[PDB]
Design an enzyme around this catalytic site. Structure first.
Site, PDB file in Angstrom:
ATOM      1  N   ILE F  51     -18.357  26.438  13.793  1.00 36.28           N
ATOM      2  CA  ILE F  51     -18.546  25.008  13.778  1.00 36.28           C
ATOM      3  C   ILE F  51     -18.375  24.323  15.146  1.00 36.28           C
ATOM      4  O   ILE F  51     -18.966  23.272  15.378  1.00 36.28           O
ATOM      5  CB  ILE F  51     -17.575  24.379  12.736  1.00 36.28           C
ATOM      6  CG1 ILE F  51     -18.045  24.752  11.328  1.00 36.28           C
ATOM      7  CG2 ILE F  51     -17.509  22.868  12.898  1.00 36.28           C
ATOM      8  CD1 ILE F  51     -17.084  24.314  10.189  1.00 36.28           C
ATOM      9  N   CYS F  52     -17.595  24.899  16.056  1.00 37.39           N
ATOM     10  CA  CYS F  52     -17.411  24.202  17.338  1.00 37.39           C
ATOM     11  C   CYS F  52     -18.580  24.192  18.323  1.00 37.39           C
ATOM     12  O   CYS F  52     -18.579  23.379  19.247  1.00 37.39           O
ATOM     13  CB  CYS F  52     -16.112  24.630  18.030  1.00 37.39           C
ATOM     14  SG  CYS F  52     -16.309  26.282  18.717  1.00 37.39           S
TER      15      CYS F  52
END
Lengths: 160, 158, 158, 160, 158, 160, 158, 160
Positions: F51-52
């Site tokens: 997700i980052c």
């Protein structure tokens, strides 16, 4: 001019046009302000007496609010120029005082603010916009005075 | 209805609604509160000193047609006549027909020649209040000065 | 009540309400918070060095009467006297009557000649707080300098 | 001065005028601000002690809000100039501390904020507008401290 | 506690709270977010090159004490000593006492002479973030340049 | 640093200070921004994944809102500078990516956003004001992504 | 698919999404509404007149990469090739791969050499509406003028 | 173009692109405004007659509100350039009148505002934003006229 006596014209009506002499004998025409300034018309009964010395003093005391790039103010009464001239000099009035003198009260009659019994205009006030339409109208009854603050409010809304 | 007694500065400009060369209706009152208006009366399309005069107006048109002013040329000719002349001459400003009644607006402004049935070469600048601020009617032989018109208009602005 | 001991810079200007040439009431306090006020005391209408002095004030009036300041001339004469003189002289600024009680305001400012019953030629500038900021009382023969008045007023503005 | 003892003057009243010496021996007159600035008057009991070291520190800490083109601030107490001078130097106070010294507490009495039993002014505060009228008035009871934020709010409304 | 190893540009300025000549408490952190701070360490009141140095600071004080900056002079002397010297010298800026513990702040900044028990003539400019932006410690005989201090401060503004 | 594991620090707390290397080996210290800029701290688990990549792309895509005269933005993860450098070059990241590398996750632990089981920082975000106090704090749970709009809202209120 | 018939000013610039030297995806549409885009097609990395041309772009890069514009260099080489060349050459602007399909974008812009399999040295400026506003394709031997590119971009701003 | 007949496209849809000749034979392309101006499309049935002489006069009478740095206005009808040219000259129309002439009504059909029985466009209006998306859509039924004030409101919100 179509006389109305005292049936005061109200907002929405075309303001009757006129050409009258001011205290210095100069002709002032209402339609000359169209497309340029909103005009405050302050009718008054008689120079030198009554509630109107106070009312015109209100106009005088806040004149910059009534005579500027957006607004003009004209006081009207049945007196002739010599009378208004002397009164204006003793009162410090520099704005125009117009003579609805002869025919007697014809303009006052046309706006419906003429006291037919006494032969003097009642204390009626109007604001005429740039299109020549009445946007504020009042006629104060004896016993009550007008308020210049209401006049400035009405004028402010025609620039706002 | 004043014939040839030209209206003076300070007078209220008579209202009018006349057809332009494209048959559109042009009304003086329409400019009130918005623009100063230059009115250029002229006698006859296709002839006279006025061809040179309107050519000078044409040659300096942007100075007369902007957000602050408009210029209208008026004569007794009907729209078809003014349309042809405007197209050949390169005129894009309104040419108005004081056609029927014949010379009625020219008469109201006091610039009508009753003997010849044509407008004299009179010019006016009407301000945003509909008041005449500049007036002229040069006599036979003498041409009008377009620079003088632009100066009068500049005075009514900034 | 100080006779001829002129009030000094820093003192609070004595309040007064006096009739002008048109019989209107003029009150010093009325200017507080709004304008600096030039007070020009003078001895007698129609005579003396003061005609030349008030003529100079007249000749430079717009510099003394504006949104930032006002100029008031004060003497022991009554309104009818000041009205006639102002009309002949072209004076449009207020000439005030320190008439009855006689010389009372001139005495409060310390510019009254008790022997002659007239004000001496003293001048003051009062600021928007009612405080005396400039003071002078030239001796016999010497005329006041209008340029000095304008400079003192300019100091109290921008 | 008309003594009121501790019957504090409230808003709407003409603020009693006065002429007092500051810590540097300069005379300060209340009426001198009329027509120019709104004036904050901070009365305090005694230099060097109590709740007012904190209250004048609040004034000091936000001084630009109290000494500017629209406002002036004056602290008043019964102490003489030599006392206020020393205290102001040790406290970093650059604003005027005025001496309501002799007659003793006469100005404090006139504003109704004088403690007749102890001979010191109570912790009273006022805002005087450009017309010389009191527009904010408070007198904090022992056990509570004043808030400079309320003083600035009051002053802001006389420029707004 | 660094003795004489002067802190370098980029280091965080050690915090301190010291009494000034009027016994008021002055804390470096108090300026964070508001002003750049000039720190002028000096050895001994009443003697040495530092009288000339602080006289130059005095002579140009408004340039160091304004809305953008403050100047603090620090030495091991107690308040009574700095008060007398400041009064005779015309110093109105804060003179702070790094008195007890003796030379503790001078040591933290690395400008302390352990043999003599006095601060060396070191100078720092601390920015609004509490970071050292300028650092100097001139050797015996050489006087510091006040113009250089003003230039470093001007760099941290506009 | 006082480890908190994953008990996330909330608003009102002093933000733990730190000195870490960025992708170009330059040292960045949190306290250096005090008195100058509000600081956005974006913790993330691992470079190159999850997700980052999307969350730092959000930061990248609206960078002018996070790096300006009033604000600074720092992304923090347990990876060393060589790793962040390569990732930043392939991702177009020009803002600082700091290494909470050795001691491993010490800063993440101090803010309470460290996943002790996996040895990576959780997706925690903070805004540190000019006084060094946390004014915004969040830690997004797996399955949900962060929103840069909330970060800009929080920052805007510390300039407003 | 126009081969070597260069697209003319006024045409809509064909859209494309290509990998840059760092394998990031760059799409022309992404600049619409935000920046004018300079497209510099070149034949082959490591050789030819284009090394001198891209060196001039490099030497004046801030003038081409700002809030008002971006510059993209396009050729048939793959990312690894452009990465090595960009690193040795000091190029920090995007070099895009019109690699597979081979020369597809160069063909769409009409600047592809079908015989040699490489783009000709064509240059375009695309405005914020995605419209081609400047176009050129200098013939063998003649180098492009970077000053001309900057002037075309300056025209599309202020 | 994918004909829709009279099933009017509504807000949220990509506006069908087109290239048509104006009254002076110049080609105008819808996509040319993308990334620069919001575009008002005023479809009308027939030059020289009906409700649209009034509707285009409204556009003409307030043109500065529709042709400026942020907005463009295009009127579209099935008539050929010679027809629109003559009509525009007699009407004082200086804005573009585009010819959806051959194929007959193809653009009108694509926007769903074509009257298949009469072979003329209905009185449909759209505002296309800078991304090419329809943000305002209307089709006035016979017996009712359009209001240029609604067009300016819609345009104002895409600059606000």
């Amino acid at each position: 001019k179509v006389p109305r006596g005292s049936h005061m014209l109200n907002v929405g009506a075309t303001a009757p046009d006129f050409t009258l002499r001011d205290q210095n004998q100069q002709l002032v025409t209402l339609r000359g302000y169209r497309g340029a300034k909103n005009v405050l018309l302050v009718f008054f009964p008689l120079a030198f007496t009554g509630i109107c010395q106070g009312e015109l003093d209100q106009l005088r005391d806040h004149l910059p609010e009534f005579e500027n790039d957006d607004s003009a103010a004209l006081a009207i009464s049945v007196g002739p120029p010599p009378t208004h001239k002397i009164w204006a000099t003793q009162s410090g009035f520099t704005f125009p005082l117009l003579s609805d003198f002869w025919p007697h009260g014809a303009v006052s009659q046309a706006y419906g603010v003429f006291n037919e019994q006494a032969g003097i205009a009642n204390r009626g006030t109007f604001v005429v916009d740039r299109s020549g339409i009445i946007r504020f109208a009042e006629m104060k009854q004896p016993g009550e005075v007008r308020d210049q603050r209401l006049w400035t409010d009405a004028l402010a809304a025609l620039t706002a």
